[PDB]
Each structure stands twice: as C-alpha cells, then as structure tokens.
RNA sequence: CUCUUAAGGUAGCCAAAUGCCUCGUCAUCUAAUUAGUGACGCGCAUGAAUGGAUUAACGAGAUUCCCACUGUCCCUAUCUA
RNA sequence: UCUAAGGGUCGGGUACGAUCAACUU
RNA sequence: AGAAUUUGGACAAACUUGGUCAUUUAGAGGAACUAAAAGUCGUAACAAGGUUUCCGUAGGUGAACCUGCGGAAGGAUCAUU
RNA sequence: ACCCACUCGGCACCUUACGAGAAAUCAAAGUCUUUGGGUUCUGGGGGGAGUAUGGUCGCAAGGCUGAAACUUAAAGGAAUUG
RNA sequence: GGUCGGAUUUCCAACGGGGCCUUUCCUUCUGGCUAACCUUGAGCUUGGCGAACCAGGACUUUUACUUUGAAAAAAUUAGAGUGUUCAAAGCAGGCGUAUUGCUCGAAUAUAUUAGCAUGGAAUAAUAGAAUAGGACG
RNA sequence: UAUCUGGUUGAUCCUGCCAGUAGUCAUAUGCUUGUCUCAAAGAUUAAGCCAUGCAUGUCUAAGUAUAAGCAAUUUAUACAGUGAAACUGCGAAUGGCUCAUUAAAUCAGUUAUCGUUUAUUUGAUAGUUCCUUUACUACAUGGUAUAACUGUGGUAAUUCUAGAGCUAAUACAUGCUUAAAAUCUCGACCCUUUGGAAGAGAUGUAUUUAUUAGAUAAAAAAUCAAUGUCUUCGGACUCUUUGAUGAUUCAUAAUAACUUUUCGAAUCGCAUGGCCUUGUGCUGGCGAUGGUUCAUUCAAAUUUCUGCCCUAUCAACUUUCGAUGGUAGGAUAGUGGCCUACCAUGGUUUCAACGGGUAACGGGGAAUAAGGGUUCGAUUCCGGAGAGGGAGCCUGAGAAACGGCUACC
C-alpha cells in the first residue's frame, strides 16, 4: 500500500531490423554527433514522434479552437525555447516537418563544441 | 375489477385506523380514506367511490409511490391484483454501430381501481417491495 | 440459524442460485413466542443495537379499548375463539395479532354504570346531573348489549404479544362484529 | 465489512486536500463531526499542509493540546476534527482568524478575516421541522440545531449564527436575484447571482446562475449556498470572487507580471 | 500351379444341446474353477424354409454368478401331537 | 380427540334460508 | 440468585448405505488411420489411359474395381434450314 | 393464315468491352479501396473426415446434425512452353 | 492603424442567432411586478393588456435521434507550468536590502452505454373525426 | 510509425496457409554484467502442511491503590508525590493477507428508505420520580460481594485452579431531595334553576393499544337545538391556532388506559471567591465522565434501471416439501414466501430460459493499435468473499469474528 511510481520508456526500435538506408543515416548521425548508441537516436525519433502526434491532432481541429490555441502556442513555445523551432516558423505547421537532428543540434556536447572549448565533438 | 366481493377473505378486510363510529349517523356510512400519489397522477373515481381494500393500492393503501416511473405493455393478467408488463428497448453494440431489440418482464401490482387487459399500455410507479418479485404499482392506464 | 435472506430459494425464472455469503447475523430470524393464557411469563430478547424486545408468554390480562366510547380497561382474557390464519391457534388458545378472544367485560360494565347510569343487560345530585347530560348515548347496540348478560365480550387482538410483550386489543363493534359472528355461529 | 472503517489510504482521500501521493501510506481520516468526510479540511491538513505551521503530525498534536487552535470558538483538541465550509478558525497567537471558503479552483483557500468577521457565521438551513413539545428548529449545513427560529425561515435559506450563543441574528431568503456561492460540483467555488430555478417535482432541483461576467451555468439546488443580496455579500469573499477565468485568459494574467 | 466336381459351403455362426483330440488357447469371474461368460477358428462332423443369424415379451424348461436369507452344514440340542 | 373438502329435496314480483342423509379422502 | 440434569422445537455439522453426473484409467479380441522401408499382387485413374470420366443408388468380386438404373460435361461433339 | 411497324412478357442468341475478373470468361460474374439498395444461406491451408461418438428420423438401406487425437508444407484454380 | 507589432468606432460584406407580418393558438385562471404601460404632466409625469418572475389548474399522443449541461473518486491516459544537474520522475517552487520577509501554483481534457435536465424538430415510427358518444358553445 | 518479405511452378498470374518481422508494468530460462535514481517480487502448481519468535493493547489533573513498592513532600492524621498488580471503561468488527467459491450472482454507473439499525463525534434537549406520595425516609447521601493481597494446596504439563481470611468503585444492586400556574376528572352544600362551590385525585419521559386534530380556490342570506365570550340577552362577533412534502395514517399535539417498567447525576479534578443573625451556615467558577429524545456525522442493511465470457452433441425450465401471486399471522432493525395456515395456478424461455464449462472475484485499468478492434486485469485504489472443510453461537453499536468460543470431519 503506497502510490506506485510512474515510469515510461523513452525510445522506440524501428519496425525493420536491417535496412541499408536507415543503418547508414543513423550511423552517420552517431559519427557526426559523437553518440554512443542507436538508442540515443531512437530516443530523438520517439520524442519527435509524440510531438507530431499532438500537432496532427491540433491541426485537424478547427482554427481558433480554444484547445488548439492554448495547446498550439504552448507546444511552439517549448520548441522555440530550446532552439529547435526558429522564430520565423511559428505556424504549428513547420513543427510537423522540423527534422530528426534539429534536436541533436541543441544537445550539450554539440553546443559545447560549437562555442569552441572542445575542438572535436568527441572531446 | 368486479369489486372482488370485498368481504371474502378469512379476516375482516378494512382500512387500518379508519374508524366508522356506529353511535353517530351521517352520510357516507362507510368512511373511506384515500390520497393522491403525487407527480401529477390523478386518483380515479373508482378509488374514491369504490369498496375494495387493497392495502397495496397507491391511492387507498399504505404504500407510497417514489423512485422510478416506468411505462410498459401488459402481457399477462393471470395473477390476482398483479400483472406482467413488457418493456422493450434497443441495446447499442458499439462494435457494429447499431442496435438490437431486447425486453424485460416487470411484474407490477394493479389496484382494483383500475381495469387492465392484455395489450394495454400502463404507467407504473415505484414502491417498496410488495412481494418476492413485485416492486412497482400501476398508477395510470393509457389503453382499453 | 433461522435466516431471512434471499440468496436461498430460487429466482423468478426458477434457477437455483449457488452458495454465497455464509449466513450473516443481520439477516437472522428467531422462534415464535406462541403465547399462552395464564401465569404471566415474559422473557427479554436483546436485538440489534441494544433495543431490548419482549417475548411474551402465558399472558394473563390485557388493555382493551372501546372505540365508540373512547375508553380502555385492564381485563382478563378467557380464551381464543377465532383466528383467520390457523384454526389450531384457536384450539391451542395461542395469542397472536388479529385473534378474536373473550374478555371479562366486568371493568367495562362497571364504568358504564358510573358514566351513563341506566343499566347493562337485564345517589347525590352531582351524579344525575352528569347522567342527564350524558344521556341519549346509552343506546349502544343490540349485538353488544346481549354480551354483558353472558359476561364476555368479543375482542380482537390488535397488538403483537411476541414483539412488545403486551396483549392489547379492541372490542368488536358494528360491521366487524357482524362479520365474525357469522363465522362463529356457522355449524 | 463487519463494522466501520477507521483508516483512509492516500489516493482515496478527497482530491482537494492536495496531499502528495508519495511520502506516506495513509491520509488523515476525518473523525465524525459536523461535516461530511468528503468535504472536510481537518486541521492536520490545515495546520501543516496549508499554513506550514507544523512539520509533522506530532507538532500538530503539540499545538492543539495547548489550546491554541479553536474552531467556532471552542478549542477542538482533536487532530482530525472535520472543519467544513464557513467554519471560523481562531488562533490566539499571531492574532489570526480564518474562514473556510472554496477557491475558484475548487479547493479550500486560506482566507484571513478580521476579529469582527470571526464573530458570526452563515449556515444553509437543511430542514425546518417540529421538535418535541411543539418546538420548531432549523438544521443548518454544519449540523447546528437552533430552536425557535423565525416563522418565515424555510429550507434552502441562509441564517447568520452568533457563534457566541447559537442564536440566529438575521436570515437571507432564497429568492431570484440573490448572491449565491456554489458548494459542490464542477462549478465549485463560483459566485453567481441566481436568475431562476426549475421545479422538477420528483427531486433534483435545478437553478440557473450567471456570474458578474455574464457566464451562465446550471447546478443542482443542494450545491447552492446563498450568501446575501446581489452586490454586497454578507461575508468577505476570497481573492478572485469566484469568476472562473478560462485557461487561455488565466495564463495571460500570470504572464502579465513576471 | 496341378488333379478333380453336378456344384465344390456364400452371407452368417461356433469347443454352441453340434469339436473327437479336449480339462482346446487368451481374458474375466475365485484363495483355488473339467463349471459360467467374452473372444479365436483348417469347423473329427456348423450353415441358410434339413431354414441361417438375431430377437422385445413370455416359460413349474437347461445352466452360471451376485444380494438377502436361513440348522444344507460346522454340530448338534430342545419342545409338541 | 379434533379439523377440512366431497350431497339430496323444498323455497323468490311477472345471493340467502329450512330439512334430511352418505362413507371417501 | 441459582449449577448438574431434563421435555419439545428449529438450525443442523458429520457417518453409513444407495442413486445420478462428471473426469481419469485397465482390458483378451476386432477394426481404422498415419508414416517408413527399392516388400508381394495386379494396373484403377491422368492421352479416346487403350471399356471416356464422374455423381446418386443397388448388387457382386483378392484388390484396386466391375455391372445394372437414372444423371452431368468438369467430353472426346458449342455444328445438318 | 401471311407482310410491314410498334409494344409488353418469355426461352435464348450475335458483336464489343464502358466495366469486371487470376484467367478462362461475364450484359452480368458490371454500377465493388470513388469500398453501404434489402435480405437468406455457406467457407476460413491439405489430410484424418463427412470418420468416431451422442442424439434424432427410417421397416431396412440409410438421412440430418457432427468432433477430437494425430499428421503435414504445401494441396489447389486458370493459363503459358515443351 | 486616427497608439507606436497591439483595439475602438459611421462603413461597403460574409456567416451564424431572435422577434413580426403574410389565412399560421406555436394551451390557460385565481393575483401580485402590472410589464414591455393608449400611460404626457411644461421637454422624465397621476391611470394601459400577468409569466418577461412567481404559489395552486383542468388537461396533459408516445418514442427513437441529435446539441448543450449536471453527474462518470483518486491513481493511471492526454495535457499546461516548473531545475529533479538531464531524464524517467515529483508537485513543486520563485523573488527580496536574504537583517524583518513577500509570492505564483498544485490547471485542463477524455471518460461507451444506462439514468437525469435541456433546445431542435429533418429523418424513422406511433395516435386521432367514418353503422361520428368528433371540436369549438 | 495507414510499409511487409521467403516457401507449391520448367516458367506465370492467383487462392491459401507455413515461416519470417516489431512490441508486451507475460512469464521462465541461458550467457554476461562497471555507475546513480526507481522498483515488482511464492499469483499460476498446492485457499497444500507448518517448528520457532513476533503481529493488540490501552490512562489523564480529572473511575477504584494501605504494593506489607519507591522517596521525600514536610501544605497536610483520611488520602492527597510517582507508581507494580488488579477491578472498571474502551478497543480488539480497523489494519494486513489471499482470490478458493461466485456468470444477473459479485460489480460499475444510476436510484430509494414515505421500508430500517447506528457505538463514537458535533448541535440541541428531563423543575413533574418523598408512592395511602403528615414520619414510609439517608438526602450534608444508602447496601453487598469480589478481584488485586496474606496464607494452605492439587497436577507431568496449559495464560489450569480450590478451599480459608481481608478491602474499594463511574463494579453490581437500591434510592429521595425544587417553584409555580393552568387544565381534566371525581366530587361535599346552599338547594335550585342562569347554578357555583369546599376538598380530593390526575396531568415529565420511555412502552403498547385505540381514538381525535393535523384545515386552507370564492362572496351573501332562512329560521330552528339552545343565547355561545359581554349585553343596550337587539346581537357588534371579528380573534377563531394550524408546519412540510410531488405524495402520506408525516412531523407534532390531545384523550383513555397499559408496562412485569426505561430514563430524569448517591460520580471525579482544579480554583477557592462573595453574604451575613461567623454556622463547617447560605451562595458561587472552569472543566471531566455519564445519561433520555431528536438532529448530525462515521456507517450498515435492503433496494430501482441498464450492462458480463464460451457453449443447443443443453429446448423447455420452476411448482413433491416454495415455484408465481393474494389474505392473515409469526419472525426480523426493518420491507419482502423470510417462514407458517388457507387460497389461486401461476412465473421464465429462440430477444436463448434452464443446464454444462471457465486453466472466471468484478471494476478503476494494462499491452498492441491510422481509424475500427483483439487480448489481458491473482496483484499498490474501490466493492465482495474467506481464515483447513462445514455448521452453530456468546460479548458488543457493529461479527455467523476464527492472532473469540462450541461440535463434527
Ligand atoms: Mg478487513
Ligand atoms: Mg482519524
Ligand atoms: Mg507395383
Ligand atoms: Mg509392375
Ligand atoms: Mg477421361
Ligand atoms: Mg474440382
Ligand atoms: Mg411480337
Ligand atoms: Mg419461354
Ligand atoms: Mg484461415
Ligand atoms: Mg479447411
Ligand atoms: Mg490445371
Ligand atoms: Mg500444387
Ligand atoms: Mg522449383
Ligand atoms: Mg507467424
Ligand atoms: Mg487461480
Ligand atoms: Mg451525542
Ligand atoms: Mg405481511
Ligand atoms: Mg403472502
Ligand atoms: Mg477462481
Ligand atoms: Mg482490496
Ligand atoms: Mg469472514
Ligand atoms: Mg493453509
Ligand atoms: Mg467462524
Ligand atoms: Mg494466524
């Protein structure tokens, strides 16, 4: 008798185990961003997938829907806040087509790299 | 109705605490108590001017109508002062997005103030448990 | 023991329900009093939530009321003469509700002389003043007057001796008396 | 089962207490008292979780056993004494007085009243009935029985209790156009100026209510608490005055100052 | 394949009241069974109105087992006309 | 030692009463 | 006031004997199915498969199968003003 | 009784493919991923198997209803070239 | 843009609501407010027809459907806010001259059917006056 | 993230299944395992069996202490400080565990109690009880036993106990002390017509029975039965008291009695203040505990409507002796075939009754999903059931209670 501790998984494995295209693009991302696993790429795909799940449900609603106005602005605000969403694209329609590695651009090691201080992404 | 030959049981059938004093004489030799069941239902003239006792009557008895008010079609009048109604309804199965016909047989008590035949439509008012299966009392007859 | 529940005997369709909920105390019953006449003996029953109940046995007397005259008296009980439920309760002189019994009819007889004063069956001026005012109302009935000659009255037990411990009733009058007399005189 | 329960698990306590689900297996079960278990503050939640005047349930017992806290002018040493709507809490220290009113979000809000406003309280009459020896009495929403009321007092009205003696000072009749306070339901904590009510013989009355901003809503009669004539009420309303702003308008107000 | 018949015993059934060998072989029934029942069939010498195979009901018909019962018995004793 | 059910014949201006008698359950 | 004891009743565990249902399980013998193995016998079907094939029904025969009656073309004929 | 024109109903027939189909073919087997006129019945890999068993009908032959254990990676349809 | 990317009005429009007339009662009495008052007193005055708000009324065709609303515990699901260093989490927290203290939160949504109130009245049913006890009277 | 691929052929297009593929708050197992946070965990088979040790006890200022206990208060010769034991009052019916039973049963949402019980809490609420009620009487307060304790003991053993001797209550069992006033009955006498009286009794609450009131849309007259408050006996006549519900024989009041009779303080702590004819005189505070009735809260019991998996190789089922309904009664806290006597032949079913199965506790929920669905839910919350299988029962407000008792297996 005590309130259970809520937990959830944060990654999704791809449906097909072996395809040349995905096994290349994902490894290109890991090598160019210095990531240890493929799970660190599945995590971003999972996180982006939930983002486009909510943005599709909002867009299919009527314009000036009180729920869409509150949730659409809040969703854009978070992506604008962390730099994934640019300031010029705040229509809730550029959310659906952002990218996979737009999130990887804002991670600590990439940004630590960008302001010098590493002179290599692995450093 | 047939007035059910009122004094027919082994005990003297009378309304409790309704005393008709024989020392004094006046009109309406037999005092009759009655009431309105409420909720807009009227008291039929048979209940007011009858001679039946029917302690389960909602107008001249000790039971009160409260709770649910239902409507059904009479399918059996073979008991004594109790009938069976059939309440049809449509049950929605969400998988197929459509309905199916269903029914329930409700045994309800009918007062001698009313006359009910098979096929008639009546409204029954909820009362306290009268018998093992009876929970409703006829309050208005809508067909003849 | 005796249970009042309903998960026993079959439903309306005739199906026999399975066993469920070993007998509970809040659905119990007990054994009938089967009250007799004479040598009063009443036992105490402890019911739910305290609430003492009285299981009368062998009751001697009772408080019977004359509805027309609006008086009540304590009178002895002679015996049971009719019972609408079972004829054996008549034969065994069992005291239950709605049972027709005889009563001594003496307290009712003595009160009538004090109140009305004329007679039943067959001194100071403060008395007949009341008697004169209490006149034109000593003509009760011919079916009750004749009983005072025999010294017994047809009463009806309106009380529950096995529940309250009391045997209280009323004297049969008017239509009710005429109904039960036909039952008793039939042969 | 076999008798009354005595423990109240967390995740089963009323949600308006704002008890964190972790940090404890149980919740304070309110004792028998003037108010329902579902709608009850009791002081341990009020003293510790609301006022932060205690760190544990042991310090709450220390405060109460010294006769500091009092409800309706009486000490009420019980740690889980149920304190409900319109109850007045007086603390001798800090010279503070409180009245239990619902926030616009449906929660009991900490409301500080003056000394004079702690000298009375309002109670919604629940039944007007004759007692023994033909003595009429009124039963308020907090279980208070007051003998010999005004003959014009009928059910659903609000009376004013002196809280020094149980006597009634003045009463507000339940008529159209009176300021009301919604107690219970989805519209809990709103103030709305009755426009009309529907009869519905049989039960479950309905009343139509529209607040100052002309937002109309309907609630059951038993959830309505008249608190005076339209405009000035008979008690000090909490901040917000029961407006029920939308979530879109609420965030702009929160964004107004930062 | 061969000799042969008028035709070479078909369907069925069987150690059956019909099988010598025989107390046939296997199973069951029993502590133990030349008894009984169920199977098998190169059947000395079963078999189709010489009627074959079945068959509910019926039988002072033959046989086996089981329950009840008991002087049939262990093992005799006593009483009456 | 009791209880109950199972009948005949007479009776209304143009529902009830009286009387008698069966062994069957 | 009151113990042991005692009458009748109700509730009624439990035991015995049967009955009924269900689930497992032995069984001489009988008769199928499946699979394997270069087993013995023939060649029934696929070509007009060398008697066109197939269906229902009945009988017969080592075995596939054969034959009678009616039917179909999935025929080997879309065809004789 | 024939001839010409029209018409309603019937047995079919010829051409084409708007369309359909895996194809053979089809004026319905069309108006079916642009998926909905109403309704009844039946099927869910091949064997075991229309078998066992239990019912029910029949004088009988048999009819109707109708499994499971087990076994298998294909059986099967229409056309193509030999 | 009459303020410096935020809203007011007299506007050409569109889209959704309400009332009235065109044969169109789409129920009402005892009485209050008499109300919107022919009420007008000199340009703000003494007096119109009751639901626009009410207590009780004979009566009162029945459903299906759809909209809105109250109910559908908490946790969980979706979801807003927020430094658990991130995250899963949790319901925290934040700001001061930090000497005295001040203060935002702990939302919102979904939650079949059944039951309840509600507006609509297309669609689908049901009933009415025919050897007239048919309605107004 | 609304996706498919390999396998029948010499080759082809299909039907079709087999195989692959991804996930699983679905388990188990294998190999391997450096860090922080978080975390299920004898459910599946066996609701099979259990050594051992714990899991229910409890005190204040305010029930009872001569501990032949501890210490000194020193304000104390009755006690008044702390405090073992025991009597008393409460609690032990909560919690925790498990999922065997259970298929309109449980349960979910939704209703009712105008059909009932409710310790505790909160708010109100007994002037009426000297019973021949003028010596019957203690009302500055009335009795008994017993534990703890001393000592004699019995059994191998148990939370076993006996005989003897003490002593307390908020233990048990008795019991009075307070105003009036009004009303209803009896009723002396003058003696009368218009008749009033001295005096006496009754009149709280609780129980039981019977009866009465508990009314109410609108306005005026006729003479009587007799005047009815006061008469200028012409009659002015009004005040005539009447709550709630949709609904009541309701709340409530009244009359007549009944009860073997409930309750109506013989209780405790602290503070000690006022008045005099200064007597242990009369008054006087804040609390605690308890108590009748109602309300309230914590609940309980029953109950309305709709809704549950697979099965016809389950189609008819229920009614001997209860099935469906009526009348009456008994029982119950209450309603009710809950049970009994008499009576009627009723009730459910292809819209699937009834029977069988479930490797079935039901929901809130879980996994996977474009949409639609499929599968699972012993298990952190809600409701139910059980303590090895049955049944029965004491205490209590509440148990068919098992860390309570009784009997059988
Ligand atoms: Mg429990
Ligand atoms: Mg508590
Ligand atoms: Mg060969
Ligand atoms: Mg060959
Ligand atoms: Mg051929
Ligand atoms: Mg074929
Ligand atoms: Mg022609
Ligand atoms: Mg033709
Ligand atoms: Mg398949
Ligand atoms: Mg198949
Ligand atoms: Mg082919
Ligand atoms: Mg093939
Ligand atoms: Mg090949
Ligand atoms: Mg597969
Ligand atoms: Mg299990
Ligand atoms: Mg109390
Ligand atoms: Mg009854
Ligand atoms: Mg009955
Ligand atoms: Mg189970
Ligand atoms: Mg639980
Ligand atoms: Mg139990
Ligand atoms: Mg066990
Ligand atoms: Mg037990
Ligand atoms: Mg245990």
């Amino acid at each position: 008798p005590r309130a259970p501790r809520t937990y959830s998984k944060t990654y999704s494995t791809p449906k097909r185990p072996y395809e040349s295209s995905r096994l290349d693009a994902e490894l290109k991302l890991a090598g160019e961003f210095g990531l240890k696993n493929k799970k660190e790429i599945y995590r971003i795909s999972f996180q982006l997938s939930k983002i486009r799940r909510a943005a599709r449900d909002l867009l299919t609603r009527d314009e000036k829907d009180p729920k869409r106005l509150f949730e659409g602005n809040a969703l854009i605000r978070r992506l604008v806040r962390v730099g994934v969403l640019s300031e010029d694209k705040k229509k809730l329609d550029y959310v659906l087509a952002l990218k996979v590695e737009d999130f990887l651009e804002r991670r600590l090691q990439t940004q630590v790299y960008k302001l010098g201080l590493a002179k290599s992404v692995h450093h | 109705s047939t007035e059910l030959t009122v004094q027919s049981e082994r005990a003297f059938q009378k309304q409790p605490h309704i005393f008709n004093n024989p020392k004094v004489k006046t009109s309406k030799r037999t005092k009759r108590w009655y009431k309105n069941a409420g909720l807009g239902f009227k008291t039929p003239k048979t209940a007011i001017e009858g001679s039946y006792i029917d302690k389960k009557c909602p107008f001249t008895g000790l039971v009160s109508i409260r709770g649910k008010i239902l409507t059904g079609t009479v399918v059996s009048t073979k008991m004594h002062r109790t009938i069976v109604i059939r309440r049809a309804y449509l049950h929605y199965i969400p998988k197929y997005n459509r309905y199916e016909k269903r029914h329930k047989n409700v045994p309800v008590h009918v007062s001698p103030a009313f006359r009910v035949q098979v096929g008639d439509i009546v409204t029954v008012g909820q009362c306290r448990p009268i018998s093992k299966t009876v929970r409703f009392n006829v309050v208005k007859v809508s067909a003849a | 023991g005796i249970s009042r529940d309903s998960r026993h005997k079959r439903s309306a369709t005739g199906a026999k329900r399975a066993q469920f909920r070993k007998k509970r105390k809040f659905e119990l019953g007990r054994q009938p009093a089967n009250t007799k006449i004479g040598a009063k003996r009443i036992h105490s029953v402890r019911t739910r939530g305290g609430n003492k109940k009285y299981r009368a046995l062998r009751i001697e007397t009772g408080n019977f009321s004359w509805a027309s005259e609006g008086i009540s008296k304590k009178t002895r009980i002679a015996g049971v003469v009719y019972h609408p439920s079972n004829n054996e309760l008549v034969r065994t002189n069992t005291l239950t509700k709605a049972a027709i019994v005889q009563i001594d009819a003496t307290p009712f007889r003595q009160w009538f002389e004090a109140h009305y004063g004329q007679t039943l069956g067959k001194k100071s001026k403060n008395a007949e003043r009341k008697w004169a005012a209490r006149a034109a109302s000593a003509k009760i009935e011919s079916s009750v007057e004749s009983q005072f000659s025999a010294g017994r009255l047809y009463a009806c037990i309106s009380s529950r001796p096995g529940q309250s411990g009391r045997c209280d009733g009323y004297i049969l009058e008017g239509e009710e008396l005429a109904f039960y007399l036909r039952r008793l005189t039939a042969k | 089962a076999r008798g009354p329960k005595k423990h109240l698990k967390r995740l089963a306590a009323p949600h308006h207490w704002l008890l964190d689900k972790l940090s404890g297996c149980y919740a304070p079960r309110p004792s028998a008292g003037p108010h329902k278990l579902r709608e009850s503050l009791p002081l341990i939640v009020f003293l510790r979780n609301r006022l932060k005047y205690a760190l544990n349930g042991r310090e709450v017992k220390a405060i109460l056993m010294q006769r500091h806290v009092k409800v309706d002018g009486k000490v009420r040493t019980d740690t889980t004494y149920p304190a409900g709507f319109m109850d007045v809490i007086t603390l001798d220290a800090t010279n503070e007085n409180f009245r239990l009113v619902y926030d616009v979000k449906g929660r009991f809000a900490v409301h500080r009243i003056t000394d004079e406003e702690a000298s009375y309280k309002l109670g919604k009459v629940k039944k007007v009935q004759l007692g023994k020896k033909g003595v009429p009495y009124v039963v308020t929403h907090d279980g208070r029985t007051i003998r010999y009321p005004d003959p014009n007092i009928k059910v659903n009205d609000t009376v004013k209790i002196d809280l020094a003696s149980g006597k009634i000072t003045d009463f507000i009749k339940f008529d159209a156009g009176k300021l009301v306070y919604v107690t219970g339901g989805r519209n809990l904590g709103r103030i709305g100026t009755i426009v009309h009510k529907e009869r519905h013989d049989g039960g479950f009355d309905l009343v139509h209510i529209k607040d100052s901003l002309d937002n109309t809503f309907v609630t059951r009669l038993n959830n309505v608490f008249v608190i005076g004539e339209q405009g000035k009420p008979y008690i000090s309303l909490p901040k917000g005055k029961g407006i029920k702003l939308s979530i879109a308008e609420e965030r702009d107000r929160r964004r107004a100052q930062q």
Side-chain angles (χ1 to χ4, degrees), chain B residues 66 107-108 125-137:
Chain B
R66 78 284 176 281
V108 307
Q126 203 174 252
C127 56
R128 75 179 165 55
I130 293 303
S131 83
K132 177 175 191 275
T133 74
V134 163
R135 280 89 171 83
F136 295 83
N137 211 332

Side-chain angles (χ1 to χ4, degrees), chain D residues 210-223:
Chain D
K210 63 178 297 301
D211 56 351
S212 62
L213 294 195
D214 291 331
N215 291 321
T216 316
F217 55 99
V218 187
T219 56
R220 272 178 185 177
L221 175 60
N222 52 290
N223 293 9

Side-chain angles (χ1 to χ4, degrees), chain C residues 64 80-84 94-101 155-158:
Chain C
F64 290 83
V80 180
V81 299
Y82 179 83
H83 201 290
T94 306
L95 294 180
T96 53
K97 205 189 162 183
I100 312 307
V101 297
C156 182
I157 298 314
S158 71

Side-chain angles (χ1 to χ4, degrees), chain C residues 1-186:
Chain C
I2 294 292
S3 183
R4 296 185 299 107
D5 62 358
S6 186
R7 305 193 168 276
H8 71 96
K9 56 185 278 161
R10 322 165 167 272
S11 65
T13 74
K16 174 174 222 73
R17 278 87 65 86
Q19 176 56 259
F20 175 78
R21 293 179 67 188
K22 287 177 186 239
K23 283 194 208 185
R24 295 285 139 105
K25 183 178 183 293
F26 46 71
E27 39 183 44
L28 71 83
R30 288 182 203 117
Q31 278 185 193
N34 290 311
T35 308
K36 295 309 145 77
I37 297 170
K40 167 193 280 193
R41 153 174 321 168
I42 300 163
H43 286 169
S44 175
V45 194
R46 188 261 191 209
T47 74
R48 196 170 176 85
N51 302 324
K52 180 184 314 302
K53 187 181 287 185
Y54 289 100
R55 188 72 75 224
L57 294 174
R58 293 185 171 186
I59 306 165
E60 265 274 359
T61 59
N63 191 75
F64 290 83
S65 86
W66 208 348
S68 310
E69 269 79 5
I71 69 160
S72 300
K73 283 298 172 194
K74 191 181 83 170
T75 178
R76 314 181 51 280
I77 297 157
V80 180
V81 299
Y82 179 83
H83 201 290
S85 288
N86 196 342
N87 277 337
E88 189 67 25
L89 316 179
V90 189
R91 219 178 64 200
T92 69
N93 270 359
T94 306
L95 294 180
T96 53
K97 205 189 162 183
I100 312 307
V101 297
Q102 316 271 326
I103 44 180
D104 186 24
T106 297
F108 297 98
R109 178 151 53 68
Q110 291 184 355
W111 168 89
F112 193 99
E113 302 168 331
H115 203 255
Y116 293 105
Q118 319 307 287
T119 191
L120 260 187
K122 283 274 165 194
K123 189 62 177 55
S124 159
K125 66 92 175 180
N126 283 5
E128 73 269 16
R129 283 199 285 178
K130 308 284 191 39
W131 304 13
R134 299 158 183 172
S137 301
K139 294 192 52 33
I140 43 174
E141 184 177 1
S142 163
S143 289
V144 186
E145 197 61 22
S146 77
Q147 272 153 90
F148 288 98
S149 302
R152 299 206 192 290
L153 286 170
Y154 284 114
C156 182
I157 298 314
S158 71
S159 181
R160 305 198 77 201
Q163 300 295 313
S164 60
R166 322 276 202 90
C167 183
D168 298 7
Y170 58 65
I171 286 158
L172 289 190
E173 318 160 71
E175 182 64 59
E176 201 148 354
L177 180 47
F179 171 82
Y180 286 110
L181 285 172
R182 304 281 310 310
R183 290 296 210 261
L184 297 158
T185 189

Side-chain angles (χ1 to χ4, degrees), chain D residues 51-76:
Chain D
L51 298 176
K52 319 299 167 174
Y53 279 171
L55 273 76
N56 290 318
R58 184 208 59 230
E59 269 145 32
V60 178
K61 194 41 156 180
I63 292 156
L64 295 160
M65 268 322 288
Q66 293 179 356
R67 320 191 90 76
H68 299 267
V69 190
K70 58 180 58 190
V71 191
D72 277 20
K74 305 184 182 185
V75 172
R76 302 302 177 218

